[PDB]
UniProtKB/Swiss-Prot annotation, chain C:
Residues spanning the signal sequence: none
Consequence when changing residue 63 to S: Disruption of dimer formation and reduced solubility
Effect of substituting residue 32 to A: Loss of protein stability
Location of the ZAD domain: 6-77
Protein name: Zinc finger protein pita
Gene this chain is encoded by: pita
Species per Swiss-Prot/TrEMBL record: Drosophila melanogaster
Organism ancestry: Eukaryota, Metazoa, Ecdysozoa, Arthropoda, Hexapoda
Amino acid sequence: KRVCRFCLTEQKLASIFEETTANLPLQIMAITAIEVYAGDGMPGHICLECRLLFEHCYRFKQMCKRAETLLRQYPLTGNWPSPLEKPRAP
Amino acid sequence: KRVCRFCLTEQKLASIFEENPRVKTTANLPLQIMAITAIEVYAGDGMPGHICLECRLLFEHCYRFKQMCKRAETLLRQYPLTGNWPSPLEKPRAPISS
Amino acid sequence: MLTEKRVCRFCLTEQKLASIFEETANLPLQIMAITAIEVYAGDGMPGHICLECRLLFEHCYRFKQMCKRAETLLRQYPLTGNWPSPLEKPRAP
Amino acid sequence: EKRVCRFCLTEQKLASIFEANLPLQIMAITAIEVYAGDGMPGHICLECRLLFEHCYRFKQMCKRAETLLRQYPLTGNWPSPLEKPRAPIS
Ligand SMILES: [Zn+2]
Ligand SMILES: [Zn+2]
Ligand SMILES: [Zn+2]
Ligand SMILES: [Zn+2]
């Protein structure tokens, strides 16, 4: 009855909609292209492990986009960008 | 000058466009990149042509996670057709190197 | 916040603007789904969208929703034995 | 019945998805991975193919608009309004 929408566990659940640049629905869309909204008829909960993996993947996506902007702007700024912080183990 | 396109490291690089025998992967790397960043990489685009091992592992990890989330969605959407509630899924392992 | 000028974030027009945040999927979610661009109030980029860009986001999002409905109905056929009928395409605004 | 459009299920005006390339456009707009032999319909109608082209060109314009906005503080060149993509000729 109460499961994680993403891995179907019953353990360590909380609301997807319970309160970062991006809310968890935005993160889920960015990483999996799954649409979630309150009252969509699908499970409304996520386990801690799935929540932390969404946050980890989303920080990866943010780093990739920062790398892309700095590389593209390098011919305008002339400042070669230093290595970025990789997001570490969830 | 020779850096990871994604984290800008100089360490542990390989070509984005070569098969990497060190990482068991489940889809081609340009597709994995596109899924997360919407960046369409190609040989000769003028951008760094390399990726570090950790960025390759992260791309594979995000793809495996997406595949589990989609399996969960299919099983949940099919439940009203049979009334058999789907069991917890076997989670994808974090990808590791070699 | 020099980028926070009064244009459409997506086509740079000054005409027929409203807030991206003006009260299913909200427009920020649609933008993410179609372009992978993160928008939030105070992100330092333009906070407005023209009517035409808003309709194009809604049109592309309805296309994505139709593609997903087709996939769900196709994957149900081996369970139900009912072949799904053709879906209504969204028409360009 | 047998050959339908993967995306709208029509039997009309079909061609192969296979032979930007259309697989890339499909991933770019819907995050669906299609490949020959995936077990799913391998055809697309003209209208769905044109909708993918139109959504891909919109996404391209949004990306170009972001790059042009982000370079403005570095150069002082304010970008003028962009030519929106028109629905492509049949
Ligand atoms: Zn979970
Ligand atoms: Zn890297
Ligand atoms: Zn606009
Ligand atoms: Zn179609």
